[PDB]
Amino acid sequence: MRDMEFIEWYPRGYGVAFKVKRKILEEQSEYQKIEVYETEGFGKLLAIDGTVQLVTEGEKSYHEPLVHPAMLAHPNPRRVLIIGGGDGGAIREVLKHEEVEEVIMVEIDKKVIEISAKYIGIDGGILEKMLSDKHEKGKLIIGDGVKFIEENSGFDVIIVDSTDPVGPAEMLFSEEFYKNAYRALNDPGIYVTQAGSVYLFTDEFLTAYRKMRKVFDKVYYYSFPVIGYASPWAFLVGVKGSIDFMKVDAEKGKKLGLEYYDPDKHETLFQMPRYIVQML
Amino acid sequence: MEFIEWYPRGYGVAFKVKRKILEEQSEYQKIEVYETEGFGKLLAIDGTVQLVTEGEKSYHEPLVHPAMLAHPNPRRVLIIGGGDGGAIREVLKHEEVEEVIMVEIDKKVIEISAKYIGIDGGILEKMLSDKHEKGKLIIGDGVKFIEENSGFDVIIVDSMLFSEEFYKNAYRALNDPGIYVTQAGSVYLFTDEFLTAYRKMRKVFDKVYYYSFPVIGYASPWAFLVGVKGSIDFMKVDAEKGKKLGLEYYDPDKHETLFQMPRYIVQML
Numbered sequence: 001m002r003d004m005e006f007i008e009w010y011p012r013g014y015g016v017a018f019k020v021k022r023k024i025l026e027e028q029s030e031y032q033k034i035e036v037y038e039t040e041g042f043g044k045l046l047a048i049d050g051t052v053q054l055v056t057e058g059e060k061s062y063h064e065p066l067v068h069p070a071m072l073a074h075p076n077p078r079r080v081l082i083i084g085g086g087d088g089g090a091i092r093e094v095l096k097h098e099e100v101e102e103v104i105m106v107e108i109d110k111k112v113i114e115i116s117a118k119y120i121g122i123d124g125g126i127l128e129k130m131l132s133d134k135h136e137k138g139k140l141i142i143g144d145g146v147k148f149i150e151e152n153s154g155f156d157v158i159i160v161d162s163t164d165p166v167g168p169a170e171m172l173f174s175e176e177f178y179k180n181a182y183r184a185l186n187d188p189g190i191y192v193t194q195a196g197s198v199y200l201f202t203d204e205f206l207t208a209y210r211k212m213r214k215v216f217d218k219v220y221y222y223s224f225p226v227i228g229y230a231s232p233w234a235f236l237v238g239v240k241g242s243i244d245f246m247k248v249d250a251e252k253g254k255k256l257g258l259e260y261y262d263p264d265k266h267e268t269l270f271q272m273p274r275y276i277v278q279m280l
Numbered sequence: 281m282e283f284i285e286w287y288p289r290g291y292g293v294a295f296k297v298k299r300k301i302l303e304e305q306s307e308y309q310k311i312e313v314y315e316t317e318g319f320g321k322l323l324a325i326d327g328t329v330q331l332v333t334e335g336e337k338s339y340h341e342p343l344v345h346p347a348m349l350a351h352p353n354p355r356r357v358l359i360i361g362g363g364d365g366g367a368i369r370e371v372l373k374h375e376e377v378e379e380v381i382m383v384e385i386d387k388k389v390i391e392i393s394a395k396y397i398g399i400d401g402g403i404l405e406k407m408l409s410d411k412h413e414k415g416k417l418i419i420g421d422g423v424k425f426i427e428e429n430s431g432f433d434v435i436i437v438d439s440m441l442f443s444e445e446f447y448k449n450a451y452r453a454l455n456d457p458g459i460y461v462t463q464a465g466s467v468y469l470f471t472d473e474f475l476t477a478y479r480k481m482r483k484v485f486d487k488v489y490y491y492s493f494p495v496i497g498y499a500s501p502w503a504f505l506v507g508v509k510g511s512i513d514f515m516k517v518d519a520e521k522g523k524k525l526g527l528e529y530y531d532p533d534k535h536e537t538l539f540q541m542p543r544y545i546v547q548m549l
């Protein structure tokens with residue numbers, strides 16, 4: 001092979017591969033291994049513990065479906081909480097909603113933020129302001145999201161944009177966490193989290209769904225073809241109050257200028273292989 | 281050992297492989313079979329994945345059933361390509377089918393699939409001997425075939441098959457009502473090809489539809505295009521007939537979710 005190659009291997013021996021121009025950096029923080037590559041045709045790739053977090057040319061296919069469905073389904077998302085999202089893509093999308101007054105971002109690994117702000121740069125300067133407490137609506141907090149949620153409440157929308165549930169993110173998918181998360185939501189409130197590869201992390205998705213189903217008033221599932229991840233990726237939604245996640249404010253969405261998630265066709269967001277639906 | 285198919289922009293689909301089973305150069309292309317570690321056998325043509333046996337239904341179901349279930353009475357069906365037999369197997373799951381003609385250019389693909397892949401449930405063997413009750417195999421070019429054949433309730437393309445002339449003939453070959461459906465490539469990596477086909481079909485068919493589905497074995501999602509003749513509303517399918525199929529991937533009860541498609545692509549139509 002004349003050029004480099006980055007591959008993330010998934011269960012069953014399936015791999016997502018990218019031709020790369022070079023490796024920009026590798027750093028071992030106290031929590032995980034953070035790496036950055038310059039891909040041949042998808043911009044920069046950020047990886048944590050060998051798993052793709054994003055590719056700069058395509059990351060909107062993940063941040064849009066992760067953020068906007070919930071934000072557009074909530075009648076008035078004024079106070080938002082983001083757990084993880086060290087790269088700033090999620091908060092960037094959240095801040096597109098005028099109703100937003102405050103967004104608290106809890107990241108456990110500050111190195112991810114520093115590295116993203118310096119080498120990824122999809123946040124459009126948001127992370128730097130966050131790092132120096134100079135952002136008007138965003139407030140950065142370095143710590144574990146599980147602990148935070150155990151001591152904080154009052155959120156219209158909670159967005160969990162963490163790594164896979166293995167390292168420090170594992171408890172973000174625990175029964176007790178969902179209890180605290182539900183309690184932390186306002187009425188009406190909405191909780192959303194990425195839930196793994198539909199086809200290869202099916203157990204992760206099913207497990208989290210059943211746990212959320214025992215806590216939230218209503219639990220929804222959906223999927224979206226995320227560029228850079230085994231496709232498609234699943235998302236789980238937990239609602240408190242009278243929120244009809246089956247409906248979103250299309251007019252507010254039109255103002256977002258989205259490229260991937262289509263709020264006008266919100267009903268198509270719920271695609272899911274039949275065999276999996278039958279297991280719910 | 282690994283098998284990787286590379287797509288535009290250096291994106292790759294990779295499978296860990298246990299062993300290579302066969303390599304044969306037919307008169308048309310190079311055909312290879314590998315046994316993967318966790319996805320069954322992989323049929324590769326000129327280095328491209330035709331299918332992996334543990335996942336191919338994720339492609340053959342959405343390719344076939346939506347159109348078969350949207351049509352009021354699919355008695356006579358045409359399939360262009362589908363040498364692996366996955367499509368014909370799915371078509372024959374519909375009781376209304378009285379005849380299905382399969383037109384394949386490379387006989388070697390059929391023989392290798394029948395012997396080394398075998399997802400077709402023995403259908404290919406019968407057809408290779410001209411002994412299947414409903415299916416009829418024809419070795420030739422689908423383009424020339426549709427130039428002189430008509431009377432199909434459903435036409436499925438699973439293989440010049442995206443030219444306006446071809447689409448005109450395909451439309452003429454359809455009964456009224458009739459449905460034409462074709463796979464249209466990787467949504468994200470072959471966007472231009474998908475758009476080009478969509479536009480040519482719009483100039484020919486009474487109604488044109490598009491949809492996508494998460495396929496295992498290829499850069500996902502995969503796009504599909506539908507051309508209709510007559511009063512068929514592709515946005516509706518017979519859910520009751522769908523239940524009898526026992527599908528694993530395509531969900532007839534949630535047919536509205538079949539039309540997922542990235543926003544920027546819809547805007548370019």
Ligand SMILES: CSC[C@H]1O[C@@H](n2cnc3c(N)ncnc32)[C@H](O)[C@@H]1O
Pocket residue numbers: 031048053083084085086087106107108109112113143144145146161162163167168169170172
């Ligand atoms: C890279 S985008 C997602 C982020 O989630 C962060 N993360 C993982 N686990 C937790 C946790 N328990 N609390 C807060 N943030 C987390 C990771 O450090 C990563 O930067």
Ligand SMILES: N=C(N)NCCCCNCCCN
Pocket residue numbers: 051052053054062085086087089090161162163164194228229230
């Ligand atoms: N195996 C994987 N590729 N897992 C990806 C985990 C979900 C994205 N983490 C957040 C990164 C984007 N903000």
